[PDB]
Every structure is written in C-alpha cells, then in structure tokens.
Write a protein that binds this ligand. Structure first.
Ligand SMILES: NC(=O)C1=CN([C@@H]2O[C@H](COP(=O)(O)OP(=O)(O)OC[C@H]3O[C@@H](n4cnc5c(N)ncnc54)[C@H](OP(=O)(O)O)[C@@H]3O)[C@@H](O)[C@H]2O)C=CC1
Ligand SMILES: NC(=O)C1=CN([C@@H]2O[C@H](COP(=O)(O)OP(=O)(O)OC[C@H]3O[C@@H](n4cnc5c(N)ncnc54)[C@H](OP(=O)(O)O)[C@@H]3O)[C@@H](O)[C@H]2O)C=CC1
Ligand SMILES: C#CCN(Cc1ccc2[nH]c(N)nc(=O)c2c1)c1ccc(C(=O)N[C@@H](CCC(=O)O)C(=O)O)cc1
Ligand SMILES: C#CCN(Cc1ccc2[nH]c(N)nc(=O)c2c1)c1ccc(C(=O)N[C@@H](CCC(=O)O)C(=O)O)cc1
Ligand SMILES: CN(Cc1cnc2nc(N)nc(N)c2n1)c1ccc(C(=O)N[C@@H](CCC(=O)O)C(=O)O)cc1
Ligand SMILES: CN(Cc1cnc2nc(N)nc(N)c2n1)c1ccc(C(=O)N[C@@H](CCC(=O)O)C(=O)O)cc1
Ligand SMILES: O=c1ccn([C@H]2C[C@H](O)[C@@H](COP(=O)(O)O)O2)c(=O)[nH]1
Ligand SMILES: O=c1ccn([C@H]2C[C@H](O)[C@@H](COP(=O)(O)O)O2)c(=O)[nH]1
Lengths: 516, 516
C-alpha cells in the first residue's frame, strides 16, 4: 500500500520545531537519524520520497538530498525539469500520488514545515510518526508540530542521548486501526496456551504466577510493549510490579505497604542523569543529604538549617524516645550513613564530638583504590555494622555499594538496598547514588558509567496508592543532564552552586507523606 | 488439514514411558496437564481426537474420555458404531482422515503407545510434541518414547515441578520449516530498524550496545526464544551474556578474565533445588563448607580432614606468605565468614582460640528475628567488615544477604556477591545459599521461598572458555529435589547424612582449574 510517515524533531514541552526559518537548535546525531531513517529501503531500484513545504525547501538551501527524491509543495514554484530528484506539486493530496503510481518510490516521508505536517495529519494521510523529542524550552519558537491525533499510539521510546548538554529522545507512534504488553507473550499460541494451562494446574506453585505481568490499567504508557528503552521505565515498571503482585503487610510504622522481594533497576549515566521526569524531584535536598553524608556528618540540624527536612521525622524527640534513645539531643541521629562512611567501627558518643582520626575511612580508601588499582574487585562501601545498629535512629537502608571502573574509563555503581520505599525514597536513592558516582568519577579522573540498584523489600506505602497511580498515568520525558561547574580537588568540597541541572522538564510534583 | 501433536510423559534419561502395561509413575498434575491440553479448543461445536494404540486403550480401562473422541488403532478390535466417542481404525494413516473431514474435529493428538508414536514420527504425521520429562531413572521400563527427529526443535521448557519428591517439567517441540533469538526484536520492522539505526549512529554511547544480545553460537538451546522458563537459564544466559559482552581484563590472579558489572539470577526453591544439571556438581563439599561457616569455624584443616579442598589454594603457607600473613599457622584463614557470621567484630588471634561470647552473633540474631518478627525488613547477614579485611586470607565474595518471610510462610533469600567466578564459584554459591535458606527455613518453621543473586563483577577466567562453551552445548534437565531426613534442634546440628538429594541426573563433570 506504501507507508507514509512523518519525521520531526520537536521541543519536549511546546513542540517547537522552528524559529525565523531555521531550527531552534543544532544536533547532528538527529540529522544522521533523519538521513538513516528516510534513506532506509528494501529495493535497490526504488527510492524514497521526502515531501516538504516550500519554506523548508528554502531552509535547506534548495539543494537535493542524496539517494532520495524531494517533493516540494508550493503554489508558486515552477514545475521544471532541471533536477529529477526534486519535483513540485500544488497541494499535498496530489503529491500523495506517489502511491497511485511511481512504482519506483518505495516509501514516503512527510519531512515537515508546520503547514505540511498539519495537513497530512488533518487529512489522515500518515501511518507512522518518528518524533525526536528535544529538551529545549524557554527559547523562541514560531513554528510548531501539531498535537498528535488520538488515533496514534506510542510504540517506542529510546533512552536519553546528549549533545552539547541538550537531552533528547526518539519515539515512534503508529496509527492503529481495527481490533497484553508482555513481550514473551502473544509470540506463539501454543507456548502461551501451555503456560496458561500449567498456571491453572499449579497455583502459587508456579513461580510465574508469583510474578504476574502488570494488568494494563497499572502499566504506564501500555501501548509501548517492545520498545520501552527509556530507563525511567525501570522505575515505573517496578511500581507496576508491586501494584500487581505486592503482598499486603504490616510494619513498624503502622502504615501498611504492598511488598515484593528482590527486584532490580538499571540506569545509564553516560548520556543522562536519572532524575525522574514523571514528577518533580527535590534535587537540592538530595544533594545536601549526600554532601552531609560525605562529610561523615550525623547532626540533623545542619540539614534543617539549610531548609532540608527529610530527616526531621526520624530525628524528633518523640521518635528517638520511642525507639529508646531519649538520651539524644534533638536531631542526633547516631552513627548512621555518614558516620559509617567516614568512621566505620568508630565509637559514637554524640553529634557534637570530633571524630577525626577515629574509625575506618571507607570513602577515603575507596577513592584511593579506585585511583591506584581500578580493576580491583573490592571497591566496596558499607553502612551495615551489627555493633552500631541499636544506636542508629534508623538502620541503614541503602546498605552496601560497589564500584567498577570500565576499560572505557567510566565509573559504574551497584547498590543493594534492603528496604525501599518506592514512592518517596527510591527517586531519592537513584539520584543520590548517581551524583555520588559522578563526584567519585570526577575526583578519580573517570567518566560516569552505569547505575544498577538491587532491592530487597520493594514496597509502596498504602497512603501513596492514588499518588502513584497518578504518576503512572504520566508518559515519561527525556532525562535531564547534570554537570559540575568546577573540578573540585576534594570530594568534600562540592557545593550546590557547583551543580548544573540542564533541561529538566518534569510533570507537577506529587505530594506524599513519609511514614515515621 | 489441521494440527497433529504428540503428548507424552517420558523419563529424563531413557525416555521410558511404560512398564507391564502401565505407567512407571503416578503424577496427577501430569494427568491434569494431559487433560487441559487435549481438551483445549476454540470452536465450541467441535471436539478433539486422541489416537492411541490398542494396548493403551486397554490400559485406561476402555472407558471414553469426556468431551473428546478416542481413536483406537487395532487390527482386531471390532469396528462397532456403539460408542460415538470411541472409534476404531486398522492403521494410523487411515485414521488421519480426521483431517479430511469431521469438521467436528478441531485438533488431533497422538496419545500414544510406543508403537503409535514411532509410526507417527516416521511417517511425518506430527507437527508438535508435548513432552513431560520425569526425573525417574533406575527403575524398569519396557516401553519407550522414540528419539525426537532432528526436524523438531525445542521452543519451551517450563520450570521444574515436584510431586511425591519426583522432579518433572514440561516442554514443547515444534517441527521446523524454512524461514533473531532476541525476544524484543522481530516484533515490528519499524522498531528493530530504528533501534538498529540508532545503534549505528551512537555506537558504545547507546547502553543497549553495551549489553548486546548473545549471538546464537554461544546461547544455550537457542531455539527456545520465548520459553526459557527453566531457571537454569538464569545461570546459562549470564554465561552467554559475558561471553558476548565480557571485557578482557587482568586481575590479582594472573589469569585474565572477561568481565561485566551488575547482573542478577533468580531461582525457585519451592518446587526444586537449584543444583546445575548441565554439569555434575559437588554438593557434599558445598554442604561441608556451609556447615563449617555456620559453626563459625575459621580452621581450614577441618575441611581438608573431611576431604574438602576448596580452601587449600588460599590457605597454603606460600600464599599466606605472599599476602603478608605468615605469622599464621598454615590453613589459619582468618576471620572471613563464619567468624563474621558468629563473631562479627570480635578480636581474632588464631583459629585454635575460644571465641564464645566475642563479636556479634549475626546468625543467632537472624534466626531469632525470622521467628519473632517475620515481617521485619532487617533480616541481614553481612561478612564485610572493613576493620578486618587485612587479616582475612581473602576478602568476602558473598558479601551480604537478606531474608524475607512471605505471607505464604516461605523464606526467600537475596545475596549480593561482589566478585563471581562463573565457571567455578557461581554453581557453588547458588547451591550453598539455597541450602542455607532451607536450613534457616526448617529451623524457623517455614518453607523454602525464592533465591535471587545480585552480582557485581561477573566474570569468566580465560582458561574456562572451552569448558564453558562445552557446558553451553548441553540442554538443561529438570532440577533435582533436596530434602532433610530429620528435623534438627539447632542449625549447627546438620550433617551430610541428613541430606537426601533426589533425582539428580546431571551431565558429566567438567574439569576447571581455580585461579589462586
Ligand atoms: N524540526 C523539524 O523537524 C523541522 C522544522 N522545520 C522548521 O519549520 C519551519 C518551516 O515550516 P512552516 O513555516 O510551516 O513552512 P512549511 O515548510 O510548511 O512551508 C510552507 C509553504 O509550503 C507551501 N504550502 C503549504 N500549504 C500549501 C497548500 N495547501 N497548497 C500549496 N502550497 C502549500 C506554501 O508555499 P508557497 O508559498 O510557495 O505556496 C507555503 O508557503 C522552518 O523554521 C523550519 O526550520 C522544518 C522541517 C522540519
Ligand atoms: N507415558 C506416556 O505418555 C504413555 C505411556 N504409555 C505406555 O505405553 C505402553 C503401551 O505402548 P505399546 O506397548 O507400544 O502399545 P500401544 O499402546 O502402542 O498399542 C499397540 C497396539 O496398537 C495396535 N497397532 C499398533 N500398530 C498397528 C498397526 N501398524 N496396524 C494396526 N494396529 C496397530 C495393535 O493392536 P492390535 O493388537 O489390536 O492389533 C497393537 O497391539 C503401556 O505400558 C502404556 O502404559 C502409553 C501411553 C502414554
Ligand atoms: C531516601 C532518602 C532520603 N530520605 C531519607 C529517609 C528517611 C526516612 C524515610 N522513611 C521512610 N519511611 N521512607 C523513606 O523514603 C525515608 C527516607 C527521605 C526522607 C524523606 C523524604 C520525603 O519526605 N520526601 C518528600 C519531601 C518533600 C521535599 O523534598 O521537599 C518528598 O516530597 O519527596 C524523602 C527522602
Ligand atoms: C564458591 C566457593 C568455594 N570456593 C572458594 C573459592 C576460593 C577462591 C576462588 N578463586 C577463584 N578464582 N575462583 C573461585 O571460585 C574461588 C572459589 C571454591 C574453591 C574452589 C572450587 C573448585 O575448584 N572446585 C572444583 C573441584 C572440587 C570438587 O570437585 O569438589 C570443581 O571442579 O568444581 C570451588 C569452590
Ligand atoms: C527538512 N529539514 C529540517 C529538519 C531538520 N531536522 C529534522 N530532524 C528530524 N528528526 N526530522 C526532521 N523532519 C527534521 N527536519 C532538513 C532535512 C534534511 C537536512 C539534512 O542536512 N539532511 C542530510 C543530513 C545528513 C547528515 O548530516 O548526516 C541528510 O543526509 O538527509 C536538514 C534539515
Ligand atoms: C493414554 N494414557 C496414558 C498416558 C498417561 N500420561 C500421559 N501424560 C502425558 N503427558 N501424555 C500422555 N499421552 C499420557 N498418556 C492416559 C490417558 C488418559 C488418562 C486419563 O485418566 N485422563 C483423564 C485424566 C483427568 C484427570 O486426571 O484430571 C483426562 O481427563 O484426560 C490416563 C492415561
Ligand atoms: O535511604 C533510604 C532511607 C529509608 N528508606 C525507607 C525504606 C523504608 O520504607 C523505611 C525504613 O524502614 P525499615 O525498613 O527500617 O522498617 O525508610 C528508603 O527507602 N531509602
Ligand atoms: O563464593 C565465591 C568465592 C570466590 N569467588 C571467586 C571470584 C573471583 O574469581 C575470586 C575472588 O577474587 P578477588 O575478588 O579477591 O579479586 O574468587 C567466587 O566466585 N565465589
């Protein structure tokens, strides 16, 4: 029948595609994509046609595109014979007669101009859309990509890439007419039927039935079945798995959860920063807690003083009293994360004491082994100290991490987290250890690698159900970028002002109460 | 023309299906499977036909099967019109006219007798094979399932199930005809080509390019693309993953490996024991090293005396020397795990010293919490004590573990393993911590749950390449069962003889040298 597909690069929030007759931006990988995509064909004796409005024709210098035939739509341009790789038409519908004839034309692409896009869509001429989402807002646009008609559904979203600090995506939308998101399903009737029957026979007894694929009403952007490349699906899909399989269970806080044991999440950090886009995340507070950790600081007031209250709850007199630490000052949390990082096995007295020299400095050693022996398999940082647990406001959650220097020269990080509050703590942990890995990488002379998080008790607190369903209804946007303004000499030296968060265009923040 | 599939239950090694006119076993779930499968149909106005040899007809008492038509092949049986649900034919070929006609007959099943299977396969009448593999050998068989023709390929392998301590699967075989083993690829031209093109543009900058799908020549039983349910694939595919992506890198050993970071494996422990069948695995030494840890013993002699030599290489006078620990008696391994399990943070001297009372007894604490506070999110056991690494013959590989009591009353286990020798240590760790979980579960009144292994440095030593590729050429068999003959009072009371390993029919041992 001959496929007709739109190909465009529009800004993530406004769908801005042009300014004063030009592109709002310069991203070569995107042009390479345009070239590969429009050039891609089966028959060597055929060519693809690239339809475009006249202004776009002007915008590219009125020079032909190799191996392809350009079809310009113009009421004024003359139909001449000079170039046989460029041809003119008076309206879109007529040019569409690439279909009813030229058998030398394999595929058709609508290659843009807002005016051309809008018609092709209005008149139901396109089957597919290749959308390069560019994280560039707050800049002038005078040309837009129309809003994608509801008859289209996304089927692929690649990971975030980066060019000159600009984050971008690649999505594919397909028009689906007439008529499970599980990839290993709907593949072969006999396999699906057999597994289904085996499941009826055994019950909880078949491990698969303990790991049911999420029903679509809890599956984010469910139409994307085989192309969920964007690594934010790694967190959304874990949410879906616990919403689908979570056992309902009581716990120390009195606010029950839905709980599954033993999931994982991997995020790339070479091209982008894993800061969730489906909800606005408080990154300043994350950074402050991280730096607070690095300095082996356990004084909660230092956090509060900077208007960061994540540790207030577990620092209160009331709480400290409840767990048997009524002897502490307000906000003395005991030998937690920071202390175990800088002074492992050190004898904790109070937050006011000087501990320089005491305990084992894991962090310092980590940076030394990382520099001097990179391929060593012992780059570990731990916070689990059986002898210190009872003195901690809260036992270590992000419990152990290990660090792996690539042959590429990048720093990758693994973290086991015994207990993970998916709504409120996970987004934090992900970003936090993404930042730490980048800080470690800079002081050791490496580039950021990959981040993998392995979870024990992965749960959602029962008062976050409607909030996370809300979140799950939001399709993800390209991840932002995070850059350091200066190269520090000591990891303890980083400051908020040193952090540059580039291109973060999240959805509204979603309120969620933390369980004390 | 419609579908003809075989349904058979045969023993793992010899494919025995009968003895003295009956089955060698009684596994009701398999009868339930047989029933689901041969009853399975779309058109509510048609029925399926089950073809069987006369002897099989005798073996089921000559009583019709509900909702189905039974086709008996016999030279002697009278062709009566009496029961419209049972029909007789003089030969298998004539019977196949179920195709040509009886549009009441939706699908056809060859339901067996060795004589009937062997004919159906020889004359090319069957398209599919449903094959329940039973782990029973060393019992009498007089009837067998023919050897599956090479024109058939395996497309599914369920997990191992257990009935009356008998391990069993089911798997599907499909007949091949003309025509990527990757699940997500091959679903849409548009998506595969986009991902491909994107890969070309970005190269190593696209995470996916850093985790390529393994090429078939190194992927176990590649024809099974969407049905690799047998949890032995969790191990085998990790092997395949590093063969395909592993980075060549040197290490302290002197024997270079191939390395990838952050991987995971999952194993069920409810229906079976995860002891690799693609190679014979030494379970006894494993158990002996395990019970050794449990007791807190750091004395390497005790294992040698029991003829277990896994800790010799790293306990010799020459080795303890190269790492500056010669002031130590030979085979005095220092406070590794065991000491860390029973006396975490205790002050270590020699192995002969009496440590009762020193250090934190994590194991004891574990068991007392698993009992009194199952839902607790802190069941942790750690062996990574920075304050003690210097004096350990070797730093801890299986570094931390977490334990999770389901509402189902089972005990699941998570282990982070900083470094993992895939050819030598991994098969051991999977079994080791499987056993430890069953021990803990018996002792605490629970049933075995699931086992997940999170790995940091996942590698293969370069001298194991031939052995591993050999292993990768062996198709998995059902896992064996592992039961305790008695209920111990304390976990320190387990003894080799208390363990009954039922139904293990591994492939031959594969010799692999351990890098010191
Ligand atoms: N990021 C991206 O993906 C892309 C962005 N762009 C940007 O978009 C902008 C150009 O888009 P836009 O401003 O909409 O201009 P267009 O490229 O749509 O071209 C408009 C011209 O096309 C002809 N035309 C349009 N409709 C008709 C019709 N119904 N009948 C006959 N001729 C018609 C007219 O030419 P005439 O006056 O001769 O009749 C009109 O002047 C530029 O800034 C460009 O940089 C362009 C392509 C891609
Ligand atoms: N594990 C499993 O899935 C199954 C196992 N079994 C076991 O298999 C055994 C039975 O198999 P088997 O011993 O091979 O006997 P079969 O069940 O295959 O039946 C053999 C009979 O079928 C008829 N027959 C066979 N070939 C022909 C032919 N070419 N022309 C005409 N009639 C033919 C003959 O009946 P006649 O004498 O009337 O000519 C022959 O005696 C039993 O022990 C049963 O328990 C059976 C089914 C399934
Ligand atoms: C992990 C971690 C760090 N931590 C430490 C921390 C301490 C105790 C915890 N307790 C529980 N039950 N869950 C947690 O995630 C948790 C986290 C956090 C603590 C609180 C919040 C939280 O309340 N966040 C709110 C705050 C709003 C804001 O940041 O301005 C949020 O909206 O996100 C986040 C992180
Ligand atoms: C994990 C662990 C325990 N350990 C501890 C241990 C210590 C140092 C190591 N060093 C290296 N490089 N790899 C290891 O797996 C390793 C394992 C083991 C050590 C050796 C064998 C081993 O060589 N087994 C032989 C033969 C012994 C047998 O047949 O029983 C084998 O061929 O399988 C297994 C486990
Ligand atoms: C019409 N237009 C505007 C433009 C710019 N970027 C886009 N990007 C996308 N994703 N989609 C578009 N339609 C698109 N259009 C174009 C078209 C072609 C070239 C161009 O130079 N193309 C060469 C570029 C090749 C290269 O640089 O590697 C080609 O090979 O097709 C530039 C702008
Ligand atoms: C021919 N035969 C021997 C037998 C036994 N086990 C097998 N198992 C398998 N997987 N495949 C076979 N062909 C097979 N055949 C049979 C056939 C039917 C029944 C039988 O009782 N079937 C009932 C069983 C119903 C039930 O137990 O739930 C049915 O509904 O089909 C027993 C033995
Ligand atoms: O870095 C952190 C700190 C705490 N929590 C959450 C996990 C649990 O919801 C709660 C800890 O409670 P316990 O598992 O100790 O009961 O705080 C996190 O998710 N990440
Ligand atoms: O349970 C274990 C014990 C040791 N090893 C292997 C992993 C490495 O091959 C080697 C440890 O080397 P280092 O991490 O110390 O470099 O021992 C395992 O795989 N599993």
């Amino acid at each position: 029948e001959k496929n007709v597909s739109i190909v465009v690069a529009a800004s993530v929030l406004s769908s801005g595609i042009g300014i004063n007759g030009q592109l709002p931006w310069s991203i070569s990988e995107d042009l390479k994509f345009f070239s590969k995509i429009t050039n891609n064909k089966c028959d060597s004796n055929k060519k693809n046609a690239l339809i475009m409005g006249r202004k776009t024709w002007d915008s590219i210098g009125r020079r032909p595109l190799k191996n392809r035939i350009i079809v310009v739509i113009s009421s004024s341009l003359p139909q001449d014979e000079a170039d046989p790789n460029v041809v003119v038409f008076r309206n879109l519908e007529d040019s569409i007669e690439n279909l009813m004839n030229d058998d030398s034309i394999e595929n058709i692409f609508v290659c843009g101009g807002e005016s051309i896009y809008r018609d092709a869509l209005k008149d139901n001429f396109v089957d597919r859309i290749y959308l390069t989402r560019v994280a560039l807002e707050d800049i002038e646009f005078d040309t837009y990509f129309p809003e994608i008609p509801e008859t289209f559904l996304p089927v692929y979203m690649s990971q975030t890439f980066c060019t000159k600090n600009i984050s971008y995506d690649f999505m594919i939308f397909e028009k689906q007419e007439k008529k499970n998101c599980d990839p290993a399903r709907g593949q072969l009737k006999s396999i699906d039927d057999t597994v289904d029957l085996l499941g009826e026979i055994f019950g909880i007894r078949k491990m698969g039935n303990r790991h049911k694929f999420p029903k679509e009403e809890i599956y984010n952007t469910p139409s994307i079945r085989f192309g969920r490349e964007h690594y934010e699906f790694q967190y959304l899909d874990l949410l879906s798995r616990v919403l689908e399989n979570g056992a309902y269970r009581e716990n120390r806080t009195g606010i029950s959860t839905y709980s599954i044991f033993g999931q994982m999440m991997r995020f790339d950090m070479r091209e982008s920063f894993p800061l969730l886009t489906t909800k606005k995340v408080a990154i300043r507070g994350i950074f402050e807690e991280l730096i607070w950790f690095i300095k082996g600081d356990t004084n909660g007031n230092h956090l509060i003083e900077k208007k960061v209250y994540i540790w207030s709850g577990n620092g209160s007199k009331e709480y400290l009293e409840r767990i048997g630490l009524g002897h502490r000052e307000e906000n003395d949390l005991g030998p937690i994360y920071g202390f175990q990082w800088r002074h492992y096995n050190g004898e904790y007295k109070t937050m006011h004491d000087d501990y320089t020299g005491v305990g084992v400095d894991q962090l310092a050693k980590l940076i030394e082994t990382l520099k001097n022996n990179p391929k060593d398999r012992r780059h570990i940082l731990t916070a689990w100290n059986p002898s210190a647990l009872s003195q901690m406001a809260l036992p270590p959650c992000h419990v152990l991490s290990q660090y792996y220097v690539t042959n590429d020269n990048c720093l990758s990080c693994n973290l086991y987290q015994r207990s993970c509050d998916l709504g409120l703590g996970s987004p934090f942990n992900i970003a936090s250890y993404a930042i730490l890995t980048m800080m470690l990488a800079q002081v050791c002379g490496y580039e950021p690698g990959e981040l993998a998080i392995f979870i024990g008790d992965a749960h959602i607190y029962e008062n976050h159900l409607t909030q996370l369903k809300e979140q799950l209804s939001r399709t993800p946007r390209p991840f932002p970028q995070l850059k350091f303004k200066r190269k520090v000499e000591n990891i303890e030296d980083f400051k908020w002002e040193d952090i540059e968060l580039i291109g973060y265009y999240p959805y509204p923040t979603i309120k969620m109460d933390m369980a004390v």
